Symmetry: D2
Subunit: 498 residues, 4 copies
């Protein structure tokens, strides 16, 4: 039997695992060490969670290696790996209310959105990839013939083997799902590190894999310190790939560590400063609605949020009046209250960073139109904010808030290429967008924008079939889509002579 | 007008550029510095070659950058880019004897082999990749629809931008062309660092890009020091991809610097210790021919040369006897002479290295059945060598020689799984092969071998359409085939709502 | 409520629909016309079944058209259409014991096989294709830019629309599943025509689509005379694709009909005379079992069965001696009994042709080693048959039997192209096989065989991922695999200038 | 030596073969039968051309079948096949002035346009398809494993064999180039039947294949009666694929014949009546330019000609007036005059049909704004024509004219779905267009149009990489694009057990 932290909320009896998941069992960390996970709604401790040690990482991994090399996962039909992954998806759906509640407690996700998206997309993610398992194909290739002889050349797609994935705290389960589904669809086994601040949906997902019959060893979760577990996953000789989403500096270190050990393959999503250009000839109310969302969605803790809105001169003031009208209507509150629109930031230290951030924006000269402060109520809520008169040299033009702060700039009537470089000046390139009703503009603007995603007349419109990843200092590699699969596959060439 | 080093050799008149190619002109390095390049057939100094300085690397990068962003190459149709690359290939052909002659002098490549393979394949590459330009396609993806609205999602494959590629010395022009043709075809610009010890066909090549009409600044070439130029390209914040083939420790470092600067994408080809497994049921005469070749091809300076031969008990002795018989017959000598089937080694330091290498095999217990020493003639020639009684723990069973040293162990009659396991006991994984007439062992062994390429009843049969790359510590990324392009393209997702 | 035929048998209580399925409701045919369906184990009348007339064909088409054009199926996400098909597969799984049993009474399929294979594969078929729904992608293409402007070119894969599929009687549910599942996955709607002699499992399937939530009109089934429904569907101006499996004469007329109406798309799969070539170096006992199965599986009623076995002189006599011993251990009997392994032929008329066929086999000079006659018992059973001494010019060497008739020819030891030649001297070309331990023989033999599928050391090894169709007069077009989707999709090219 | 018709014209001495081209040699038809080919600039006989008889067809097929089965074309590497086809484009380039004059003579194509587009695009198509040869690739597929044994499934893509292709007269060289290039690229051989009224460029083409090194018998050409040649090819037992482009009645008959003989494969491109919908928010003047071209290009002799312009009510009259302004500026005359805009129709009988068509438009109530007549001068000119007040039931609203006839209908402001019905109420569906500055209608009208090509803010912008073909009664199959290659290839699934 599994030890749970029981807790009655949202009409529910939650049963939450709080330990390391290694080898298909929940165990305490070495020397029973633990740490506190914190509910951002009121500041309380939710419980104590195991704190992984170097020798626990070694066990997660030995188990991942054994499951891959000798266990069932590596011996069964691609189609059957499909079945299992599609079953895990049914289980996740059977437990959806419970997972969205846990994600609301653990991470401050407004409960309606945690159902429809955090958990909703998690489920689509496994179901999509399960589809791929028996549809991953190699090639036969018509090479030159060694006459008087004959040659056949074919390629076999194979799994890379044991993989370490490190997940961010903005959407704990969904991001777990994005990287894990693809990784396992390709026939790998995995050691997962959820962020230190958000371990709970990972741990419950762990248990679901048991409920789903996924073979002992295939999934191993290690909550705890990022630089203890992330570091060792990178150095380890039996790990062949690291998937990393997170901060830039930590990214660089990770790739560096991958290089120094065994030249493991590495993915990196290091956030962004995504531009959104809004011309005069767009549909303005809709630009307001979608503009607001491009910033405020999931309390701005969103690696592709619009980090700079460039609004055409002649509609700028009208756009700002309208955004202010609508911001006053958002309902800030507890994530479990059904009428809540805008919930807490994820943890305390981020709320501090948000405060410091808008302090500095005011200092350096920008115009603060609303918000900027902690909301006066318990927990870690932050007021939806709007800056105008942002000039390209300001820190709030260069830096990623990861919070609900709308940073607006003007550009001149009909002045396309100039606004284009302003928008391209960054060393990020994770996403971008443009609103206009003119087709020429839209097409042209999407060619020139130096970002991995261009949204046209919509925003935050990701999908499990559509690949996701940045250019430049946002990193490289994709999550979601056929393309995702390639990070977790290796290609073998086989050339016969006969 | 271009300065040349003129030489009457091989019934032609080589006219060799010897300088830096930067932005369309041959120029001297900073401070007019130069180094000598040496002819391995006689020990003499072919000529003086510019020695590239940090400020030159930067000038080469700035010109690659201008050409990508504001040059014609970035404006022209994909079809016309293809045209230009087919032209280049025609020019290369028109100069085939000169290029193979240059390569004979600079690298010691036997002229016939050079003409057929080094240059032949080179020309095939540019031809192959030429036809890819206007067939590089993206996708349209049926995403869930934001009803009542509609969504179109598509992808654009786009060039990554300024690239830097670092070429080894074993097939100077060929290796250059494997990497450049793919890079160029995807629409990038390039800065190429050929090995210090082999700069010559790379500068001739550069002159040819001029004959071909490749716009100024698309190709730039920088002979010089490996660390000086490699390190600078790795750090430069305008470079976005490194392609690298070379030694383990250098590669790791390259990958490190890529991480610590701007998360530039990277590729690593790091050689191997490739196992070749020979079963008593193969055609034995053919196995001696192909087996010998698997080692001695291009005097062993070959990244997928067979590092270890495992030969079945029942035929081990008859197999050795026959190899020895056939080695006696090889004419070693001047690469320019028609009779010659074995050139000198590339350079002096690699020859001394092969000498230490075989002493070391003897000290540790392996039988030295022939060769082992420098051939007593001018230049840097090495004896085709054969070792037997080689135990799994020996240094020469683990380390990559890069020379003509066939290294043979036995295995037990019947013992399939056992041998696979010893063949897989390396942290290399570049290539492998199996000889046998049995369909069942061939398919099974090819599954179980842990390497990027598996040759079945042939060896060294690469082709411009078949992807080439390692697993484990041989690195990652592919040269050749369609897969090679994915290394030099990026995917932008455009998602419209309407 | 639905009118059933109830039947207690095999320890279940069968509930079998028996009417036209049209617009999601079972209805009687024009003027209440009916015909009888005969149990082949005993010749009795299972029941009356509706007899579709012309006005019914139009009603079914008119329903499919409305459901494609205005109903949910043409409006939902590709992703969700996936879910409906995975759901249909789970419903078929839930009624699996019952479907196997209807297939036993209706088609004389041995129960244990009907369950593992007819039903089994049918489930995989819907699971596999449900997978494709949202992995069906078009392209983005790099056309020449109309300077000084820009062009964008993409392709959208769209459904074809209303399809008619005509299903054979050999594996009724399975072959329905084959063509239906791909058709639906691509977003089409369908009118299905099962074989006059095997309507039952189709009609029960029609009911299960109700349980799965498939919108009304998407599936429609019309039992009846093949030549009336078949005729009308292929004439109808609102049907845009016929998928057909059946005989040459009928297939031909159908294609002719598609042309004279509205130039509908067609696929044709017209049977086979598949050569199996058995080499002396093969594993003789496996060769015998796989040989047995190659002819006897599903009492030979199988478009891909080995209709000639060529055996190498040195092992011919020993092969026949063994085949005969095995033929003799075959238990013949009621498909419902656990220990039966050779059930009755599908229907009387077919049984009669099998009789006529061996009459001519004997008349024309072939040695009849065993069987070749109706088993004396009731219903329609036929005796496992083996002919040896078959000469190329003979009727039984040219015409497909589609019964359990093994037809053997010698070929001279070591004569490969000569037998290849004989194996290819047919206007069929649907499948083939070679048994041999020689990789070289195996690979060469598979190049040279003029056939849609080549098996190597196995036979009847179809898989839902592996495309299935013939060359020459056996047809064109694939079932199964990614290739299947192509027969049911159109490609639209969109070219913008901007 | 070949027999020429020598003509000094357009500063050149043309050398025009006039014989049948069978097996690499030009020859008279059976009993030397000939027919004349008429210059439509002045109605003069150009010269007499051989007239293919049945025996002749058979000879050509046999020469193709021999070349495919046993000749060089069949044994070479796909890469070497690529090369020859590239050489073929080069020879055509060197002859490009000559071919364009020949086409100006035989087809009345304006010389400037024959050079740039008729011949230019031909040159492109060969170049395009040459690149595809060594890049046509099969699959390796993850099927379920027959445990404890193992399985390998792969697909080989192979040629179909002898093809027959029937070429229309409107762009004789170009159309021939379209089908022949992909056909040859895929590995097959061919009998090409040019239009009876336009043999000359096809025959000049055949000479060129000689110069190019195409093996004797890969390309066979048979000028003469359409019924005689095309009908024989369709029934021939040794032909395996027909590619047909022309008229609906002849197309239907062709498909029928493929069915009746051996179920050979068939493509049909059967013309269009393609709608071009112009919205009031377009650029008015670009619309009048692109609009005029959409109809008048190549004298209206164009399968994707805009057969109806639907102009939004509010901009109609301004549009019709501007169009009249511009039609009066078009210069009419000799195809060799370098300032000609509009040349003669292709032949008398078509001129005569243009005349009748226009009478009929007026008779049924449409408004003749200009033209609708033979231009009085020698040869077969027809006036550029504008019709207005066209209504949905009229004959000229339904029938394809294939002449230079603008047929305009108004449509009510701010309806969109209602103009789509009108644009879709034809049984043609080859092409279509939308002019609009508004992205939302553009993307939506592109989905909704039932045609194989949608131009958006441009027209007639085909391209060798972009697939061309029809839906509904326009036929099926593609020319141009990767997807054309699959009309000419078959797939072999090969399945191992081991």
């Amino acid at each position: 039997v599994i030890n749970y932290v029981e807790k009655a909320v949202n009409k529910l009896t939650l049963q939450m695992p709080y330990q390391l998941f290694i080898g298909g069992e929940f165990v305490d960390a070495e020397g029973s060490k633990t740490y506190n996970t914190i509910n951002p709604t009121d500041g309380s401790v939710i419980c104590q969670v195991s704190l992984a040690q170097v020798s626990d990482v070694d066990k997660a991994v030995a188990a991942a290696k054994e499951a891959f090399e000798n266990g069932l996962w590596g011996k069964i039909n691609a189609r059957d790996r499909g079945r299992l992954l599609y079953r895990l998806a049914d289980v996740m759906e059977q437990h959806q209310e419970e997972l969205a509640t846990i994600e609301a407690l653990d991470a401050g996700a407004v409960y309606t959105l945690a159902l429809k998206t955090h958990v909703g997309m998690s489920i689509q993610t496994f179901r999509y990839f399960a589809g791929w398992c028996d549809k991953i194909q190699g090639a036969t290739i018509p090479i030159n013939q060694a006459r008087p002889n004959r040659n056949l050349t074919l390629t076999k797609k194979e799994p890379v083997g044991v993989c370490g994935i490190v997940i961010p705290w903005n959407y704990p389960l969904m991001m777990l799902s994005w990287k894990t589904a693809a990784c396992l669809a390709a026939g790998n086994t995995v050691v997962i590190k959820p962020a230190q601040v958000t371990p709970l949906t990972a741990l419950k997902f762990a248990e679901l894999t048991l409920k789903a019959g996924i073979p002992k060893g295939v999934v191993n979760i290690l909550p705890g310190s990022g630089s203890l577990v992330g570091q060792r996953l990178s150095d380890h000789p039996d790990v062949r790939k690291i998937g990393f989403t997170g901060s830039t500096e930590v990214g660089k270190h990770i790739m560096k560590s991958c290089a120094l050990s065994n030249v493991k393959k590495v993915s990196l999503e290091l956030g962004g400063k995504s531009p959104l250009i809004i011309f005069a000839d767009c549909d303005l109310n809709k630009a307001v609605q979608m503009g607001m969302s491009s910033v405020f969605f999931n309390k701005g803790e969103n690696a592709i949020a619009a980090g700079r809105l460039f609004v055409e001169e002649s509609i700028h003031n009208q756009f700002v009046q309208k955004v202010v009208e609508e911001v006053e209507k958002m309902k800030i509150g507890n994530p479990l209250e059904r009428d809540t629109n805008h919930g807490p930031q994820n943890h305390e230290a981020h709320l501090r960073k948000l405060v410091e951030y808008c302090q500095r924006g005011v200092k350096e000269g920008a115009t603060l139109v609303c918000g900027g402060n902690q909301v006066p109520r318990p927990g870690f809520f932050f007021q939806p904010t709007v800056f105008t008169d942002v000039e390209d040299h300001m820190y709030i033009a260069k830096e990623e808030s990861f919070g609900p702060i709308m940073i607006i700039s003007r550009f001149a009537d009909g002045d396309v290429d100039a606004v284009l470089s302003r928008a391209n000046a960054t060393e990020f390139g994770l996403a971008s967008g443009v609103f206009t009703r003119d087709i020429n503009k839209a097409l042209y603007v999407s060619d020139k924008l130096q970002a991995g995603t261009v949204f046209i007349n919509t925003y935050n419109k990701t999908d499990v079939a559509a690949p996701f990843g940045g250019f430049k200092q946002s990193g490289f590699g994709k999550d979601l889509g056929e393309a995702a699969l390639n990070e977790y596959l290796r290609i073998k060439t086989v050339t016969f002579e006969y």
